[PDB]
Design a protein around this ligand. Structure first.
Ligand code: NAD
Ligand code: NAD
Ligand code: COI
Ligand code: COI
Lengths: 330, 330
């Protein structure tokens, strides 16, 4: 078949090329995202494959319907930037890749946890400043001696629980929709108990509106002194302001943030002004007990390979069997 | 009983005090190390407890013998700075703490491994330089998808193997004196195969003279491109020069060094000149794919607590049962 791909990223290229060789299909990829203008390149292809945070507007589906392209598969999870109504209107079907690599994210959460437990940021700051003696004065903690609280026992949450348990840590979890049946690796506890007992709090919950600021001032007040919070999930989960105050007061020993609350706004400022123009960001970046990352928890060779291969397979599924396990409808 | 402790470090104090309360024994501690002058403070105590890299000279044992103190227990592992002959001459007995916390070191090795697999140093360097976009261009790797080669299957090596296996990694190991019997978590392979197949090489071998530069030019030549080497063991294991060349040529993706080859020499320069005066150190410190630490792999609250409690228990063992599991005699 003939498939056209949009939003092709530097690391995806080799996989796109390899998938073409492996399956014998024709794959044409483009750096540009899919919009009303670029969708015109798809005339004559059997399906479209894309990855972008920019909108998938009604116009895109209109031209697709016009060229007879009935399927669109995305390489990521989120569908919030997709005009679903316009899509259903033009009879276009969609599938995403909900679990390209839960391990990539779980491993990143472990990476930030160990980094903070061993005060790696404080250590590196002192070495760079030329103070070798002071660099060795921040006593660390063993993950195997901690109680880790995981919020969200979905795909990623389960993998993170397994990794934490591998260190010998005591693992407790909270999820409004608990798994049914046995799970020897952890115990479900109430949200209050999770906050009160956890040395490390790891977030793996969806970024739906009702989870906005689920970690807020009240949550921070329940936490034990010296707690660590890791967020590789979504930007709206933590009240960054309250977080900062608790870092300053010493309540929180450190935090690992891969999805910064104002990332979207800041990326816009960066484009228009060449800087984040964000004083909160600057303050956090200057604290050695804070480890910020530019939304890269998913960023591994395995994950990127899977984003490409899985999404393309879903496309081939639609095109041959007329159904696929990850079809999205709402 | 009455016990005097030397070389008391900032983090050890609370444990010294707590041990006194817990056992009801009298414990007097000092910041100063044990030498011919300070040993005089021990007159009237039942035993001596110390931790230092400075020498334990013949004179120290002479005054001990004079005050009737028959036992010395150290809080660390190494006994190379102890005049054993002088000690045996004056009938003084010794015990060390060979495994205060193998987990502290194994966890640190995992910390450096994940840090490098996710290019954390490159990421942090770019964020600090204000380049958020570039900070997200260093694709990482999943530990669970790697083949990890562990050198040395002793106390620490075994714990590290367990932790790596917890991630799902394939683990192979090399030890001149293989464990007897079953060990489902890893396979023993020849040294050449370990170098040729490992994505990550983790060292947990003793720093005896014959292991000097066990990781040398020839070893580096056998390694696969993009390999990572972790050394939380001893300063003499890696030919740092050859290592640097292989980092520069791109053969090695990164290294985590907790025991720098010229640490001892450099600490002396630091004292006399206020700087390491080490260009090799400076060059390594400037590479974001190199993670140096000031000999802190053991540095956790659990390890320090155990160094204190275990060594004191060994002292109490000598003083009451006249024997202890960790007595050293050569
Ligand atoms: N940073 C990145 O690079 C990256 C990449 C992919 C996905 N993510 C995000 O990570 C998060 C977890 O993803 P997943 O695949 O495990 O999701 P999942 O849907 O499989 O699991 C989420 C779980 O959280 C539970 N939940 C909902 N609200 C909760 C709350 N208030 N408290 C506790 N649990 C709650 C749900 O019941 C569900 O079981 C999602 O936000 C996902 O969108 C981040
Ligand atoms: N960085 C730190 O803070 C720190 C702290 C404590 C100990 N250490 C060191 O870490 C190392 C490992 O300690 P341990 O308690 O596991 O030791 P151990 O004696 O229990 O095990 C070492 C093992 O390595 C094996 N061995 C010897 N030479 C080897 C070689 N050439 N190749 C492969 N294996 C070899 C031995 O047969 C032995 O089984 C030691 O050097 C110890 O002194 C470092
Ligand atoms: C943008 C993706 C690459 C990562 C992510 O968080 C997602 O799946 O939406
Ligand atoms: C100096 C100790 C605290 C650490 C160490 O490497 C040792 O046990 O000798």
């Amino acid at each position: 078949m003939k498939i056209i791909a949009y939003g092709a990223r530097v690391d995806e290229i080799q996989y796109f090329k390899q998938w073409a060789k492996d399956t014998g299909n024709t794959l044409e990829y483009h750096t540009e995202f899919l919009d009303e203008n670029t969708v015109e390149w798809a005339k004559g292809f059997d399906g479209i494959n894309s990855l972008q945070t920019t909108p998938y507007a009604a116009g895109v589906f209109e031209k697709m319907h016009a060229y007879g392209i009935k399927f669109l598969t995305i390489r990521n999870v989120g569908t919030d930037n997709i005009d679903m109504t316009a899509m259903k209107q033009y009879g276009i079907r969609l599938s995403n890749v909900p679990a390209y690599s839960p391990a990539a994210i779980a491993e990143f959460a472990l990476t930030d946890t160990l980094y903070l437990l061993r005060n790696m940021g404080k250590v590196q700051a002192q070495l760079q400043a030329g103070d070798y003696e002071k660099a060795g004065t921040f006593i660390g903690k063993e993950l195997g001696q901690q109680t880790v609280g995981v919020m969200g026992t979905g795909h990623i949450g389960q993998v993170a629980i397994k990794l934490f348990k591998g260190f010998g840590a005591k693992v407790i979890a909270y999820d409004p929709y608990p798994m049914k049946g046995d799970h020897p690796d952890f115990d479900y506890v109430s949200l209050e108990d999770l906050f009160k007992q956890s040395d490390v709090i790891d977030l793996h919950v969806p970024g739906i509106e009702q989870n906005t600021h689920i970690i807020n001032e009240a949550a921070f007040n329940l936490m034990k002194p010296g707690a660590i919070v890791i967020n590789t999930a979504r930007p709206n989960l933590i009240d960054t302001q309250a977080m900062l105050s608790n870092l300053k007061s010493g309540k929180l020993a450190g935090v690992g943030i891969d999805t910064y609350e104002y990332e979207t706004e800041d990326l816009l400022n960066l484009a228009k002004h060449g800087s984040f123009k964000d004083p909160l960001w600057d303050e956090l970046l200057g604290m050695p007990n804070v480890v910020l990352s530019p939304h890269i928890a998913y960023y591994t060779e395995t994950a990127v390979h899977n984003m490409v291969y899985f999404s393309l397979q879903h496309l081939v599924d639609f095109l041959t069997k007329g159904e696929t396990s990850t079809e999205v409808t709402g």
